[PDB]
Amino acid sequence: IRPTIGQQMETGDQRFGDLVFRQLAPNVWQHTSYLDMPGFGAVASNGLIVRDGGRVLVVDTAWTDDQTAQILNWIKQEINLPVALAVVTHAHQDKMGGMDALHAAGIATYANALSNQLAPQEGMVAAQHSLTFAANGWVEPATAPNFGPLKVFYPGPGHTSDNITVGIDGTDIAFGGCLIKDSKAKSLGNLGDADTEHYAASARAFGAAFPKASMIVMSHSAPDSRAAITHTARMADKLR
Amino acid sequence: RPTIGQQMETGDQRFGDLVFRQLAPNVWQHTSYLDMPGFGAVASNGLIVRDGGRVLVVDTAWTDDQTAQILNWIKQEINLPVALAVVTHAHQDKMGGMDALHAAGIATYANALSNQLAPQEGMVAAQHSLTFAANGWVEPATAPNFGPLKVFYPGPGHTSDNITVGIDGTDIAFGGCLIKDSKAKSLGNLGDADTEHYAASARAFGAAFPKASMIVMSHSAPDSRAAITHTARMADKLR
Ligand SMILES: CC1(C)S[C@H]([C@H](NC(=O)COc2cccc3ccccc23)C(=O)O)N[C@H]1C(=O)O
Ligand SMILES: CC1(C)S[C@H]([C@H](NC(=O)COc2cccc3ccccc23)C(=O)O)N[C@H]1C(=O)O
Ligand SMILES: [Zn+2]
Ligand SMILES: [Zn+2]
Ligand SMILES: [Zn+2]
Ligand SMILES: [Zn+2]
């Protein structure tokens, strides 16, 4: 309803149980789930849902298994196609807290190899499959089969050392996950697992890997313009 | 590098685990941080005011040890006695450090209601209770020798007991957790909030100190009066 961190509800948003869904393009929706800390309030976290042909691809879980099952129920009701796979963008609760729910549903899960290696140490269940990346950041094609329009890019360490990003070919949309903050943000969020030396280059690498995208989607704000990339990089420049 | 709260900047002095910023010749902002695993540091701001040969404090830090650090900083940088502290409602970021003030012999004041809620909020009550008139102004007999501290209860908002403090002889007024900055996305923790009256209460604070141009608040750097108006606009949507 009214998050302490993350974007507020707005027109075009549809509420479904404890979640909020927003259509970004004919075949792309943003999913939002909330972690309610008592004495603090709710923290919104955003992922994506993509319809590619006759299947659904998910980017990021919700905070919990129950919330992620609710995402799968919303897909069932609104899209009514099989969910082929999910990619999770790093090993923290807001992006991988729901992995058990995906596995129980028979959905194949993919994450950066480093995310799977860090998962147990971060309290997460590892994905079933590991993505690896070239030196230029692009996913090694053989590790990401049947990804449809998803273009998976590892920009370098920033918010975490394992954070990855996803563009949707054929759309105006690129997803920065927790690496990218909105153009009006005052801070870079939780830096406790962050690489302050490389953060700025990582944000600029994300921008150069998805040069066309005009809708920048991120974990804790509403979709923004490319000004979110420039602003994130400039706040990061001050960390070094 | 706080997850919540302002970042460091020129003019910010680090002292132990805290940060101090001079806002005026006789007014400083104290900032302390609560690290919460999985989320990072949350900053919380209060004020320190010099009034002649004595010092006055608004709000503790999150913890006793942090609050004792504030007293150490005052001792080092000002070297005058703290006559009294006013705490602005019964939550940890504003009253978490009561025990440290009391160990130091400092007289503590809170809204009577804050003192009544403190036990239920895991807090230690101030030793003196402020009471308020029907228009929100503190009853002067309950705020003796407050010097420039002009205490105002704006109405329920962030909590039912939240109070605010204007600094007479300056253009500074302190909204505590009632007021969020002009660029804020949300009203923060609404769990204990009065959503029906929040908007009126924020505007009441602005009306009580109509000439204060620097608005200080618990979780953002000092701001303009657009902090007040934006906070009220957000609260209008709660009704
Ligand atoms: C600042 C963030 C929005 S919190 C998030 C991530 N946290 C977790 O998934 C774990 O979630 C938590 C656990 C325990 C208490 C919590 C209290 C409040 C909120 C979350 C809590 C993280 O640590 O990076 N990503 C950051 C960011 O994108 O910058
Ligand atoms: C959102 C706030 C900045 S937290 C604050 C107040 N919190 C507490 O003193 C209790 O402390 C906590 C407990 C549990 C988790 C926490 C995580 C992060 C920070 C504090 C936490 C409150 O309850 O209002 N005032 C709010 C606001 O002004 O809007
Ligand atoms: Zn994270
Ligand atoms: Zn995040
Ligand atoms: Zn509070
Ligand atoms: Zn607060």
From TrEMBL, chain B:
CDD domains: NDM_FIM-like_MBL-B1. Zn(2+) 2 binds at residues 93, 177, 219. Signal peptide: none annotated. The keyword Zinc-finger does not apply. Residues 43-219 form the Metallo-beta-lactamase domain. It catalyses: a beta-lactam + H2O = a substituted beta-amino acid. The modification Cysteine sulfenic acid (-SOH) is found at residue 177. Pfam families: Lactamase_B. SUPFAM superfamilies: Metallo-hydrolase/oxidoreductase. Its cofactor is Zn(2+). Keywords: Antibiotic resistance, Calcium, Hydrolase, Metal-binding, Periplasm, Plasmid, Signal, Zinc. It is found in: Periplasm. Gene3D superfamilies: Ribonuclease Z/Hydroxyacylglutathione hydrolase-like. It is an enzyme of class 3 (hydrolase). Ca(2+) binds at residues 64, 99. GO terms for biological process: antibiotic catabolic process. Belongs to the metallo-beta-lactamase superfamily. Class-B beta-lactamase family. PANTHER family: ACYL-COENZYME A THIOESTERASE MBLAC2, METALLO-BETA-LACTAMASE DOMAIN-CONTAINING. NCBIfam families: bla_class_B_core (NF012229), bla_subclass_B1 (NF033088), blaNDM (NF000259). This is beta-lactamase. It comes from Klebsiella pneumoniae. The gene is blaNDM-1.
